[PDB]
Structure 1
Amino acid sequence: IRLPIVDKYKDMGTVVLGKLESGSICKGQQLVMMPNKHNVEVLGILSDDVETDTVAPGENLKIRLKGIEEEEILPGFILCDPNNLCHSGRTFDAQIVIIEHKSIICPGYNAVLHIHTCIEEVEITALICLVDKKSGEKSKTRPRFVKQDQVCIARLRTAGTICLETFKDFPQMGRFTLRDEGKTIAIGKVLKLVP
C-alpha cells in the first residue's frame, strides 16, 4: 500500500496529508513509514472531508497518527505496509527527455527532483544511451552531453534518500521531473533502481 505524504502538522496531535495512491487503509491498523521503517498507527481518517474508517485508493486523506517521532516527518515519505512495503533510493537509471532548456546537459548536471511528494536535490552522474525516436532504438556509446528535445537514459543520485519505485513498476512513484530554476528543464521516467 502507498500514501505519499504532502503535508505535516501538529494540530490535534500529529497529522499527515496525502493522496492514497495504492492499497486500502484501515482506521487504527498499523502502518510503517518511509524511508525509515518508522512505526505508526492510525488514529483517525478524514477522506475528502468527513471521516471514514476504511478508505481505499483515490481519496484525499488527512490522518491523525500515533508514532515514535512526530514532526520528524517530511513531505515526501510514503505511508506503506508493515510488512511488505516500499523500496527506497539514492541511486537509479532513467529515461529522460530534455524539454525547455534550452542549453545543455552533460554528466554532473544538477537540478531539483520532483517524483511523488518527495522533492529532493539531485544530480545526473553519467548518461547511458541516447534513445532515438526511431523504432524506440537505444543508442550505442555514451554521449558526453544531451541537447534539448533529445531523449536518453541516465544515472541519477539523490542528495540523501528517496522512497523510490520504478515507473515500469508502480508509476505513481515513477514519473518524475528535473526542475531547474522555474523552467521544467526535463521529463524523467525511472527504469532501473541501483541497487
Structure 2
Amino acid sequence: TEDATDLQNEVDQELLKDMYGKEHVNIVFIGHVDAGKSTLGGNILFLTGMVDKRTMEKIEREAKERAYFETEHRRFSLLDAPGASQADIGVLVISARRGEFEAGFERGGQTREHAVLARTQGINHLVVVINKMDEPSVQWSEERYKECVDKLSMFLRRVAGYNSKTDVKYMPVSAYTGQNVKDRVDSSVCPWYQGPSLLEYLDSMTHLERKVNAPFIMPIASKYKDLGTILEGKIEAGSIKKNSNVLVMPINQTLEVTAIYDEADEEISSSICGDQVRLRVRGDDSDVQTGYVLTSTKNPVHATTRFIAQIAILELPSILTTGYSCVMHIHTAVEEVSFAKLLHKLDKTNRKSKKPPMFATKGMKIIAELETQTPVCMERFEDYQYMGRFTLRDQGTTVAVGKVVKILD
C-alpha cells in the first residue's frame, strides 16, 4: 500500500554531474564596517578553488571607498545589500572582538539596522556568523562566544522578531585564518564546538527562502492507512500548515489537510520544503495514488503528457527513435513514456547537433520530445530540480537518465 526507492536508483557512475548541474542559490552577507564580511567573502572564494591567493588578497584590500562560489551540491551567487534578485540565505556577520561586538549594540550600531535590513529582504531564517574567534581578545573562549550568541539572541527577537531557537543559526568562525569556514575547526584549537563548518552547513540546509516561498509541492510517496488516509513525501517546495487546502494533480481534486507528522510521529503545526513529512488528509481520496503530487490550490505543480528532455542512455540495447516504450520515474511517479519526434544529440561540451539523431544507444545523450499516454506532474529541472529529474527502465532493467528541459502544451 506504498512505494519505496524513487530515483535513489540514480546509483550510477558519477557523470550524473554534467547534465544534472549544481543547485543555484542566492546568498547575501549583511554586516558591519569591520565585521569581516569581505575577508570572509574573499576567504570562501579562495578556500573554495574559485580564486587564487593573490586575487583573494586583492579583494581583502579593495574593501576601501556576479561573483560566486561552489560546494558539493550548490553554486552560491553573491548579492549586495542597500526572483533571482531576492536572497535565499541571509548571513549576518558579527565580530566577537571586545569593543567591536559591544559597539554595534549601542548607538552608532548598525546591528539593529542590519537585523531590520534582513527582515527588509525576506530573510526569515538568519544565519549568524560570529567571526574573529582567533583574536587575542577572544582566544576561542567558549564563554565569549556563548556570551555573544545570547546577547545577539535576546537582541534580534526584540528589534526584528527573530526567535533564535528556530529562525537563526549561530556559528563561530575565523575568516582571516580560515578556521571553520570550509573544514570544521580541528578539536585542538577549539574542543567544544561540535557542529559543521560554515560551508558544510550552507551546502545542505533546507530553508532557502525562494524555495520556502514557492508554491507547495510534495510528491506523494505512500498510501498506507492509520486513522484514515496518510501521504508521506519530501516536500520539494513551499510550505504546508494545518487546516490547509491542497490540490492533487494531475486529477485537479481539492482536498483539505488535517494533521502533520514528522520522522518521530509527533504532531507539528507546520512544515517547510526539504522536510520529509507524513501528511494526513481528509476528503474524496478515491483517486489518490503514489506518484501524484500535492500542491498549492493557486499555483499548482505542472502536469503534461508531451515535453522536451535531455536523455542519456546506459546498458546495451541499440533501440532507435520515434517509438521507444519504457518506464519513467521523475519523482515518485512511475508512468509510461514513448520517445516521439526527436531533435538533437550531445557531445562532451554539452553541445547539441545539427542532424536529428538517426537513433541513440550505449554511449549517447539527446534532447528529445517524449509523450506519455497519461499525465504526470513535472517541472523544468532548471526550476525545480527533483521535479524534473527522471530515469528510464525497460522490462525490468534500467536503460537511461534525463532531466526535463521544457514543458509542452
Quote the Cα distance in structure 2 between the aligned partners of 1:138 and 1:98. 15
| Structure 1 equivalent of residue 406 of structure 2 | 192
Residue type of the alignment partner of 2:280: R
CA distance in 1, matches of 2:300, 2:361: 38
Amino acid in the other structure paired with 2:281: L
Per-residue deviation, 1:140: 0.4
Q: Which of the residues 261, 269, 288 maps onto 1:53?
A: 269
Offset at residue 24 of structure 1 (A): 1.4
- 1:122 match: 337
Indicate whether 1:183 and 2:397 are aligned.
yes
Whether 2:273 is the aligned partner of 1:62: answer no
Distance 1:155 1:90 in 2: 10
Could you tell me how far apart the structure 1 residues matched to 2:354 and 2:300 are?
36
Structure number with higher strand proportion: 1
The alpha-carbon deviation at position 82 of structure 1 amounts to 1.3
Q: Which residue of 1 aligns with 2:311?
A: 96
In 2, Cα distance between equivalents of 1:20 and 1:3: 4
Root-mean-square deviation over aligned CA pairs? 1.4
Question: What is the CA–CA distance in structure 1 between the aligned matches of 2:239 and 2:269, rounded to whole Å?
Answer: 10
Per-residue CA deviation, residues 142-180 of structure 1 (Å, 9 max, x unaligned), is: 122112111111111112110111111111101100111
Write the letter of the residue equivalent to 2:320. I
Q: Matches of 1:194 and 1:101 in 2, distance apart?
A: 30
User: Are positions 1:32 and 2:225 aligned together?
Assistant: no
Match of residue 386 from structure 2: 172
1:14-67 CA-partner distances (Å, limit 9, x unpaired) = 211111111111011211111122111111110112221111122221122112
Equivalent position of 1:146 in the other structure: 360
Count matched residues.
193
Structure 2 counterpart of 1:182, which letter? G
Cα distance, 1:9 vs. partner? 3.6
Say if 2:392 and 2:400, in contact at 8 Å, map to a contact too. Answer: yes
Aligned counterparts of 1:107 and 1:80: Cα–Cα separation in 2: 33
- 1:9/1:71 contact within 8 Å kept: no
Counterpart CA distance in 2 for 1:16 and 1:71 is 13
**One-letter amino acid of the structure 2 residue matched with residue 58 of structure 1:** G
Cα separation, 1, equivalents of 2:307 and 2:321:
17
- Whichever residue aligns with residue 352 of structure 2, its letter is K
Mapped contact 2:318–2:360 kept (Cα < 8 A): no
Residue type at the aligned position of 2:362: Q
| Structure 1 unaligned spans of 5+ | none
Structure 1 residue 137, shift from structure 2 partner: 1.8
1:5 maps to what in 2? 220
Relative contact order, CA 8 A, sep 6+: which one is greater? Answer: 1
Letter matched to residue 90 of structure 1: T
What TM-score do you get using the length of structure 1 for normalisation? 0.93
- Tell whether the 8 Å contact from 1:4 to 1:77 is kept in structure 2 after alignment: yes
TM-score under structure 2 normalisation?
A: 0.46
SS at 2:397's partner residue? coil
Asked if 1:111 is matched to 2:320, the reply is no
Higher share in helix: 2
Larger radius of gyration: 2
Shift of 1:190: 0.3
CA distance in 2, matches of 1:180, 1:51: 41
Alpha-carbon shift at residue 117 of structure 1 (Å): 1.0
Contact 2:304 2:376 in 1 (8 A): yes
Which string of whole-angstrom CA distances, capped at 9 and with x for unpartnered residues, describes residues 82-137 of structure 1? 1111111100011011112343332201100000111101110122111222x322
How many Å separate the matches in 2 of 1:194 and 1:21? 22
Give the counterpart of 2:351 among 129, 132, 137.
137
